[PDB]
């Protein structure tokens, strides 16, 4: 119950609605423009009716000496529009505002920066923010779910991202801040018509949360029986996905021309000459689809078939049953029965820390406890008549079997995969 101490507002999904489960009974009014789902996610758009109003229980008591409280929530911010970089970088918009008599707090966003602002009764202001890079090949934050926690005490305001301290601002100068006014969740500013934000698990505490307490809540809220996709949403059966490899982030799978194997190519990247932004393309390579062996949620330990689309037909990923080396090239072919190929894969999650990566274990039989190997990427010698050249191939490897047991789990292992479905928050026009 550690992560339930001092909680004074806990918004949770219930019957197609959002309700305060803090135990203090705050009134919550979600207007028709807010999209909600049973995974506790809610979307704020640019529509005028896309808003939530929370009226706090006025009997709640706050620290009278100094501002001693914390706010936490998960958020997913869409990628910038390539042809709208300037507005992205410059236009700041409020997403959550709690003001009373011109005093209070607010959470706002300017491009790739998330901002926390406090205004005391004298009108004095202070802010602290977290900005993520927008020039990396692959970002851990753009359009992906991440955990935010802001804490305030007598001396400073801190921002923790995914359980870790990222920013701090001294606020010893700030005097009384009125924090019990109405909370308005709504995009406010000069925003594009297509702008939107997803949020989840919004909570407020009347105390400064410790780093230990914050890291703990991160893990508890990251926990689920099901696997997640690249953006952090639940992984699904019967859904098209591109594949990403954590150990070779700039690599993607492509069916080799005239050969039933998967070769690994290099991800292309942003063309247009904008020194402000850089990224590698995500929607490339073969389109895969996970099928249940037996639209659902793919859970750890499930037995599946990893299929993909090859010219108007659904194909499948197989492993030869008798390769004699440590690792071998996977066989990518039509769906059919065979004596010499395994097609059953058990999807796993070996990491004990929050992750969006999963592993693919080929099984002889669902029943047999025998382990054939894990799917990964390996460099194969393609020695040609002239001289020997090498090339990476989509493979099965027995070497990962032992490595995945080492603790702490190695996040960079080549057997770590992520699934990327097309998402409205990530657009990559040529």
């Amino acid at each position: 119950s550690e992560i339930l101490n001092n909680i004074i507002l806990n918004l949770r999904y219930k019957d197609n609605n959002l309700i305060d489960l803090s135990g203090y009974g705050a009134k919550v009014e979600v207007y028709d423009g807010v999209e909600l789902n049973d995974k506790n996610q809610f979307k704020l758009t640019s529509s005028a009716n896309s808003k939530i109003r929370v009226t706090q229980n006025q009997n709640i008591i706050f620290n009278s000496v100094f501002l001693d409280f914390s706010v936490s929530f998960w958020i997913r911010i869409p990628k910038y529009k390539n042809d709208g970089i300037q507005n992205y970088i410059h236009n700041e918009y409020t997403i959550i505002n709690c003001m009373k008599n011109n005093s209070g707090w607010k959470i706002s966003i300017r491009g790739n920066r998330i901002i926390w602002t406090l205004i005391d009764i004298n009108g004095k202001t202070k802010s602290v923010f977290f900005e993520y890079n927008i020039r990396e090949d692959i970002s851990e934050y753009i359009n992906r779910w991440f955990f935010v926690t802001i804490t305030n005490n007598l001396n400073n305001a801190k921002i923790y991202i995914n359980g870790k301290l990222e920013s701090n601002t001294d606020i010893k100068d700030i005097r009384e801040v009125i924090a019990n006014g109405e909370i308005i969740f709504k995009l406010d500013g000069d925003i594009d018509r297509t702008q939107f934000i997803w949020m989840k698990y919004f909570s407020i505490f009347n105390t400064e949360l410790s780093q230990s307490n914050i890291e703990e809540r991160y893990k508890i809220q990251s926990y689920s029986e099901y696997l997640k996709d690249f953006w952090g949403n639940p992984l699904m059966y019967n859904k098209e996905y591109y594949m990403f490899n954590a150990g070779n982030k700039n690599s993607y799978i492509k069916l080799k021309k005239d050969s039933p194997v998967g070769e690994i190519l290099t991800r292309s990247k942003y063309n247009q000459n904008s020194k402000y932004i850089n990224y590698r393309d995500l929607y490339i390579g073969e389109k895969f689809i996970i099928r249940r062996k037996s639209d659902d949620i793919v859970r750890k330990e499930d037995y599946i078939y990893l299929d993909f689309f090859n010219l108007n037909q659904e194909w499948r990923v197989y492993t030869y049953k008798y390769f004699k080396k440590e690792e071998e090239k996977l066989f990518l072919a039509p769906i059919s029965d065979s004596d010499e190929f395994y097609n059953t894969i058990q999807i796993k999650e070996y990491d004990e820390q929050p992750t969006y990566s999963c592993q693919l274990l080929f099984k002889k039989d669902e029943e047999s406890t025998d382990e054939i190997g894990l799917i990964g990427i390996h460099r194969f010698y393609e020695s040609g008549i002239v001289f020997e050249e090498y090339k990476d191939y989509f493979c099965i490897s027995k070497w990962y079997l032992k490595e995945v047991k080492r603790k702490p789990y190695n996040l960079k292992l080549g057997c770590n995969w992520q699934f990327i479905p097309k998402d409205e928050g990530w657009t990559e026009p040529p």
């Binding site: 050969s259 039933p260 030869y320 390769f323 090239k329 066989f331 039509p334």
Partner: peptide, 17 residues
């Protein structure tokens, strides 16, 4: 029918040599 068999052969050559 199943040319799955022909492919199986292109596979074996791809790994063999």
């Amino acid at each position: 029918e199943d040319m799955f068999a022909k492919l199986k052969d292109k596979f074996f050559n791809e790994i063999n040599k």
